[PDB]
Amino acid sequence: ASRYLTDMTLEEMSRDWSMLIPKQKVAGPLCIRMDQAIMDKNIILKANFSVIFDRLETLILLRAFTEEGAIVGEISPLPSLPGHTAEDVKNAVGVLIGGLEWNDNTVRVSETLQRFAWRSSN
Amino acid sequence: MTMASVPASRYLTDMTLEEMSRDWSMLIPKQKVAGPLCIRMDQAIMDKNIILKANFSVIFDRLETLILLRAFTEEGAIVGEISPLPSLPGHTAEDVKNAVGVLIGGLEWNDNTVRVSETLQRFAWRS
Incomplete structure (x- = not known):
């Protein structure tokens, strides 16, 4: 029985999205995607x-x-x-x-990401 | 960083995203307001392991x-x-x-x- 720990609400995780100016990268076993149209934002x-x-x-x-x-x-x-x-x-x-x-x-x-980063480099 | 600062909630779940987001319906709906919580179930379901x-x-x-x-x-x-x-x-x-x-x-x-x-039984204690 796996459990999951998340920073995101259900609505944030289930929401559809698309890229106006797409950029993608296969990074070994992981897929990275981002929208290049986004600028001057806090993310x-x-x-x-x-x-x-x-x-x-x-x-x-x-x-x-x-x-x-x-x-x-x-x-x-x-x-x-x-x-x-x-x-x-x-x-x-x-x-x-x-x-x-x-x-x-x-x-x-x-x-959560900070924890993962910290505990991985112990 | 104040005494009133509402901290960020994270979420711990037994369910995958699909289990949580999936729609469902009741063939025989049955509901109860149990204080601050809403309880719903399908009265049509029988003889299952749940x-x-x-x-x-x-x-x-x-x-x-x-x-x-x-x-x-x-x-x-x-x-x-x-x-x-x-x-x-x-x-x-x-x-x-x-x-x-x-x-x-x-x-x-x-x-x-x-x-x-x-998770649920841990939330109810006490091991």
């Missing part, structure tokens, strides 16, 4: 992770939200679910932040 | 309030639900425990066997 990354024995284990879904609440980016596992490491996730997050910063967006990460 | 799964908000690393509970058959169908009243008046662990008890009795009338997730 927060929010994640959903599987939990196993009180530890954040597998990334299920990450989405980037503007302060007004629009989805402007996403990282997700390839649907074949090949499996990924903590390093794959940290690498993909840094790559997404770099891409969003190009258009002078300021990007921050949720406490 | 599991209760929940999504709780987490504040300061503690389970705070029930956001959504759903009852699932072995085949994965939703046959019951407990959710906060639309007005979100606030509720206690005891309100949740009572509503769960009420839902389980209701589902047992038709010879369904009901079990609860690890």
